[PDB]
Enzyme design. Structure first.
Site, mmCIF file in Angstrom:
data_model
loop_
_atom_site.group_PDB
_atom_site.id
_atom_site.type_symbol
_atom_site.label_atom_id
_atom_site.label_comp_id
_atom_site.label_asym_id
_atom_site.label_seq_id
_atom_site.Cartn_x
_atom_site.Cartn_y
_atom_site.Cartn_z
ATOM 1 N N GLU A 161 25.557 -61.828 -56.362
ATOM 2 C CA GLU A 161 26.608 -62.729 -55.984
ATOM 3 C C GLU A 161 26.279 -64.174 -56.328
ATOM 4 O OE1 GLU A 161 29.761 -61.841 -55.129
ATOM 5 O OE2 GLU A 161 29.951 -63.996 -55.482
ATOM 6 N N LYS A 220 19.652 -63.245 -62.262
ATOM 7 C CA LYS A 220 19.991 -63.995 -61.071
ATOM 8 C C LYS A 220 18.814 -64.791 -60.582
ATOM 9 C CE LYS A 220 23.140 -64.757 -57.770
ATOM 10 N NZ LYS A 220 22.951 -66.073 -57.146
ATOM 11 N N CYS A 276 19.112 -69.465 -50.334
ATOM 12 C CA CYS A 276 18.930 -68.945 -51.678
ATOM 13 C C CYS A 276 17.740 -69.565 -52.388
ATOM 14 C CB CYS A 276 20.189 -69.084 -52.533
ATOM 15 S SG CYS A 276 20.000 -68.382 -54.210
HETATM 16 O O1 LIG Z 1 23.184 -81.504 -56.916
HETATM 17 C C1 LIG Z 1 22.855 -80.950 -55.865
HETATM 18 C C2 LIG Z 1 23.412 -79.712 -55.492
HETATM 19 C C3 LIG Z 1 23.043 -79.087 -54.312
HETATM 20 N N1 LIG Z 1 22.106 -79.724 -53.483
HETATM 21 C C4 LIG Z 1 21.675 -79.162 -52.196
HETATM 22 O O2 LIG Z 1 20.907 -78.005 -52.468
HETATM 23 C C5 LIG Z 1 21.375 -76.898 -51.683
HETATM 24 C C6 LIG Z 1 22.029 -75.955 -52.708
HETATM 25 O O3 LIG Z 1 23.272 -75.449 -52.226
HETATM 26 P P1 LIG Z 1 24.386 -74.851 -53.235
HETATM 27 O O4 LIG Z 1 25.437 -75.904 -53.331
HETATM 28 O O5 LIG Z 1 23.668 -74.475 -54.626
HETATM 29 O O6 LIG Z 1 25.005 -73.529 -52.628
HETATM 30 P P2 LIG Z 1 24.176 -72.352 -51.949
HETATM 31 O O7 LIG Z 1 22.767 -72.647 -51.580
HETATM 32 O O8 LIG Z 1 25.057 -72.063 -50.615
HETATM 33 O O9 LIG Z 1 24.231 -71.208 -53.056
HETATM 34 C C7 LIG Z 1 23.323 -71.280 -54.182
HETATM 35 O O10 LIG Z 1 22.582 -70.084 -54.148
HETATM 36 C C8 LIG Z 1 23.445 -68.975 -54.014
HETATM 37 C C9 LIG Z 1 24.092 -68.753 -55.365
HETATM 38 O O11 LIG Z 1 25.064 -67.735 -55.219
HETATM 39 C C10 LIG Z 1 24.755 -70.012 -55.905
HETATM 40 O O12 LIG Z 1 24.844 -69.824 -57.312
HETATM 41 C C11 LIG Z 1 23.859 -71.222 -55.628
HETATM 42 O O13 LIG Z 1 24.513 -72.436 -55.982
HETATM 43 C C12 LIG Z 1 22.309 -77.554 -50.693
HETATM 44 O O14 LIG Z 1 21.502 -78.147 -49.707
HETATM 45 C C13 LIG Z 1 22.921 -78.638 -51.553
HETATM 46 O O15 LIG Z 1 23.573 -79.674 -50.781
HETATM 47 C C14 LIG Z 1 21.560 -80.963 -53.858
HETATM 48 O O16 LIG Z 1 20.746 -81.503 -53.105
HETATM 49 N N2 LIG Z 1 21.926 -81.589 -55.058
#
Ligand SMILES: O=c1ccn([C@@H]2O[C@H](COP(=O)(O)OP(=O)(O)O[C@H]3OC[C@@H](O)[C@H](O)[C@H]3O)[C@@H](O)[C@H]2O)c(=O)[nH]1
Ligand SMILES: NC(=O)C1=CN([C@@H]2O[C@H](COP(=O)(O)OP(=O)(O)OC[C@H]3O[C@@H](n4cnc5c(N)ncnc54)[C@H](O)[C@@H]3O)[C@@H](O)[C@H]2O)C=CC1
Ligand SMILES: NC(=O)C1=CN([C@@H]2O[C@H](COP(=O)(O)OP(=O)(O)OC[C@H]3O[C@@H](n4cnc5c(N)ncnc54)[C@H](O)[C@@H]3O)[C@@H](O)[C@H]2O)C=CC1
Ligand SMILES: O=c1ccn([C@@H]2O[C@H](COP(=O)(O)OP(=O)(O)O[C@H]3OC[C@@H](O)[C@H](O)[C@H]3O)[C@@H](O)[C@H]2O)c(=O)[nH]1
EC number: 1.1.1.22
Lengths: 459, 459, 129
Positions: A161, A220, A276
């Site tokens: 996913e 993945k 993740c």
């Molecule tokens: O540019 C960014 C993007 C994200 N982040 C932070 O890093 C973390 C990453 O969160 P994401 O937005 O990637 O979303 P998630 O962790 O919920 O899901 C993530 O892993 C699950 C996979 O299915 C997705 O492909 C992946 O994006 C969050 O704390 C986010 O705020 C940053 O600090 N900078």
């Protein structure tokens, strides 16, 4: 040859729940039953207050619950009568033994595989759908291979996913790609083909990738790592910026306009969280060590190390501005979720920043508009009783606070009445913007009288 | 109100040459004189055989040489009468002293800045344009600040070049962005504005980014690092693929379809080369050490280490398939340029693979359709006389060879008549595809009787 | 680069373990052309002390002004009283700009503004940066 009419998903969490809800909304002629052992979680799925916060989810669930979408605690009968069985359970990190603190525990995946054998006859398709799959397909297959009935024919697929929490609905409806792994056999192809059919109800055929199970899982792991790496790379640059009077957001834009680099995921922050990313890199590291690839192992480890450094640096910036003493000092923590638009706290940088400040004896007043207050309490574990207060709203938290620390990018934090906060804060009034949400409000906040410090601008 | 009519560019190399040629083609009312100390290079610029191979460059130069584009060895007079002076010289890596093997030598940049002061009066704009700018703006400025005439007013700008060799024309015409750095002063803004004017002749205004000089140089350092990192990341995955029977190209596609990750620069390879990437990362690492950011330093270092590992692994793969002995064995090296569609060999993975094989005593027969043969000879330095032959064409090279090693992704390599090669190769006949060029021709090559091994795959 | 002072302290000809030897070697590894003046250290001693690479980079100056003629920077290593006395306007005219003085001994304290007025970039141990 084969058509999927009944679907069962074991695990009703941030993966299983929403992903099934969407399947039901897109495939009205398919029965989708989502099962869990956690009773109060299922009950909540059936209530008007869902167990997880996710934009647009109440709308998707309500549109087809009791119609073709069901949530039940009756695992056994759902597996018994299902054509496709999803495994979307959690694989928590091993707390003891080899891999302690690093490798994932496949115990719950295994429990599911077993329980499927015990409850199944005929043909069924078993599909593993996790956010970070670690040797999962293979471990299911070895249980099935050994517990063989006659006329029982269980096909194993991997279907990772890609959804990101907070935008699960938008992502599930218009995914970038769908990845399905199956065996390279006549029987394998037919199972893969059957699952594509489900997705083809709303996903374009050339956005669906088919491969073998292992290549699928590895994809993945890698994909997740690359994503995590980008955040760590930009965060690294954010330290360089603070040291030399440049501004990471500006530098980021310049990096981002290279169409070879892309302009997404360059938003420097207090550090990445969620269930993740950290878990995924650790497992990739561990895997490489086991395969005798120490060079690869130590390459990817850097993503974790940079992230740890990013957090620790930000923490000691706050402790510094308060002259290395925060005993009995009121500090407001705005945001506890690992990102905006979710209630999930798993691995939130908030937890860590919080703990660092607790080790300094700070009185913390924590507000988050969506994170359950019991969850905050669990997450910071005694020492909690003496130092932690969960605030009802942000203004309570900032009342008499020496400093305000923003950890989650909740849109509502740009909105707050900052003159009001400044009046009732102890001076000098510090705002620490760990998310870059207060960009553009910069002068205003200084005019009001704030000492304002943010990630990646002006140390 | 200032308008640039006369341009002079010091340095007539892979950066200065093409970037000026394109300026002249887009701005027919501007006199563009490119100067160098190297006489036979300038002569070649003025001949019908250009000193560097670059697709579409002959066409661009010929269309406006003698009309508005000039190449001359007369540095002094070009500086004297110019409104804008580009510095596009090389900053080679220091071979001795602090920074040995790591930090860049600004000696030539400084020599230029001095020579500019000595030859200038009135108002001039001095712009530094390099592929990897290291403290270059600042060093120019300190020379100008100290050698001050009256009525001499020299403005310093940074304007990093993003072109990639082999596609310089295409890139210069439709750049992703243009980055200009100038001082945040009244005088600074006017100079920046003047340079935008030149670019606005063919580049949309919202594709042009303006900032301060430092923020500009740092952006380029970072941007380059990010790029390099992608290659190293995918290369790391390629080792994982080889160890577990997955295929890196497949995995790559799956990673690439994440619109947050982008799908460019995921082409696993024998290792990145060229004068930009390795040199850029080393300087970034060195800069971080000096700023007391060891955590950042060691993070980026991993890009280099992975790349080194990538090369070394591929090398000992070849040595392995030949039972750890290659004494007096004929091996064909196809491709010596660091990438396709150029003559440039600076840091080419070909140099390194070649040397590893030379330390084993292999007789190398090297072919590249565009690299000058003197350059191959310089690049492998005696031991050269005994082991190296530069082949006239690929078939000479493969004649009686135990193995064929592809290092550069030249399009012509898919074309070769492989049955012909296989007939006159010693058996078993090995092809080592370090570039993934022979994907799709896989069965055919096995049918013919090749033992075929490629990066990111297993036999 | 002009090195003024080679003896390990003032009023002697002794170089044994002089900081000058070390500063000089560091600057040699950078490929600097050194012009070394000391009013009492035998020239031959300087030559022995910097050991080939010496022939290419080292010149023993007859007097301080020869040393600073066309120098990028002046480095003071020994607290010889005569160094305060030098005609600094004369030196600055024939130095390459920017003209750096590095006072490793604190001998030019008090002459501070004067040296800046003249146009020097003046850096010393224990001050500024
Ligand atoms: O540019 C960014 C993007 C994200 N982040 C932070 O890093 C973390 C990453 O969160 P994401 O937005 O990637 O979303 P998630 O962790 O919920 O899901 C993530 O892993 C699950 C996979 O299915 C997705 O492909 C992946 O994006 C969050 O704390 C986010 O705020 C940053 O600090 N900078
Ligand atoms: N749980 C943890 O601490 C961690 C999990 N992960 C991984 O990341 C992904 C996140 O998945 P989520 O939906 O967010 O997890 P989740 O915890 O939110 O939801 C999983 C649900 O599965 C249920 N479940 C577990 N075992 C079961 C069983 N044997 N039978 C029936 N139900 C069972 C659980 O009770 C839970 O309600 C997972 O797919 C996993 O790969 C990564 C790091 C930590
Ligand atoms: N040359 C090397 O070994 C390395 C160079 N680099 C970097 O790569 C970037 C790309 O530049 P290119 O055009 O490819 O290099 P180039 O060497 O192909 O072109 C530069 C030209 O400038 C001329 N030149 C040098 N010094 C001069 C001077 N003082 N006065 C007049 N002319 C002078 C040289 O004769 C040379 O032909 C450079 O900007 C530099 O940052 C990085 C690592 C190694
Ligand atoms: O997927 C890839 C992409 C690139 N590479 C390698 O990386 C090396 C450099 O490739 P490039 O396309 O970046 O060519 P260059 O090094 O000349 O240009 C690079 O440096 C200068 C900057 O101005 C450019 O923006 C940057 O692309 C080559 O060896 C190339 O083969 C890979 O090995 N795999």
């Amino acid at each position: 040859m084969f058509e999927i009419k009944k679907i069962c998903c074991i695990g009703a969490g941030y993966v299983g729940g929403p992903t099934c809800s969407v399947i039901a909304h897109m495939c009205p002629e398919i029965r989708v039953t989502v099962v869990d052992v956690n009773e109060s979680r299922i009950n909540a799925w059936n209530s008007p207050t869902l167990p997880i916060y996710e934009p647009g989810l109440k709308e998707v669930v309500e549109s087809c619950r009791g119609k073709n979408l069901f949530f039940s605690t009756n695992i056994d009968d759902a597996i018994k009568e299902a054509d496709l069985v999803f495994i979307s359970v959690n694989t928590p990190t091993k707390t003891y033994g080899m891999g302690k603190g690093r490798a994932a525990d496949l115990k719950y995946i295994e429990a599911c595989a077993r329980r499927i054998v015990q409850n199944s006859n005929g043909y069924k398709i078993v599909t593993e759908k996790s956010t970070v799959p670690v040797r999962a397909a293979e471990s299911i297959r070895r249980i099935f291979d050994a517990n063989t009935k006659p006329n029982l024919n269980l096909q194993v697929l991997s279907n990772p996913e890609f959804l990101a929490e907070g935008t699960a609905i938008k992502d599930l409806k218009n995914p970038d790609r769908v990845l399905i792994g199956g065996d390279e056999t006549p029987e394998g192809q037919r199972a893969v083909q059957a699952l594509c059919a489900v997705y083809e109800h709303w996903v374009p055929r050339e956005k669906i990738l088919t491969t073998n199970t292992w290549s699928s899982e590895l994809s993945k792991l890698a994909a997740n790592a690359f994503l995590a790496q980008r955040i760590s790379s930009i965060n690294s640059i954010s330290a360089l910026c603070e040291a030399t009077g440049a501004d990471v957001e500006e530098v980021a834009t310049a990096i981002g306009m290279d169409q070879r680099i892309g302009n997404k995921f360059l938003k420097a922050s207090v550090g990445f969280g969620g269930s993740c990313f950290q878990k995924d890199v650790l497992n990739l590291v561990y895997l490489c060590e086991a395969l005798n690839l120490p060079e690869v192992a130590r390459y990817w480890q850097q993503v974790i190390d940079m992230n740890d450094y990013q957090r620790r640096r930000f923490a000691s910036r706050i402790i510094d501005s308060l002259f290395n003493t925060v005993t009995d000092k009121k500090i407001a923590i705005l945001g506890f979720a690992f990102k905006k638009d979710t209630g999930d706290t798993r691995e939130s940088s908030s937890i860590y920043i919080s703990k660092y400040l607790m080790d300094e004896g700070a009185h913390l007043h924590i507000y988050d508009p969506k994170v359950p207050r019991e969850q905050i309490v669990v997450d910071l574990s005694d020492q909690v009783s003496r130092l932690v207060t969960i605030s009802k709203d942000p203004y309570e938290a900032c009342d008499g606070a020496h400093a305000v620390v923003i950890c989650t990018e909740w849109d509502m934090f740009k909105e707050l009445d900052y003159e009001r906060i400044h009046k009732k804060m102890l001076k000098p009034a510090f705002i620490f913007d760990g998310r870059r949400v207060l960009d553009g409000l910069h002068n205003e906040l200084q005019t009001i009288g704030f000492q304002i410090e943010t990630i990646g601008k002006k140390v």
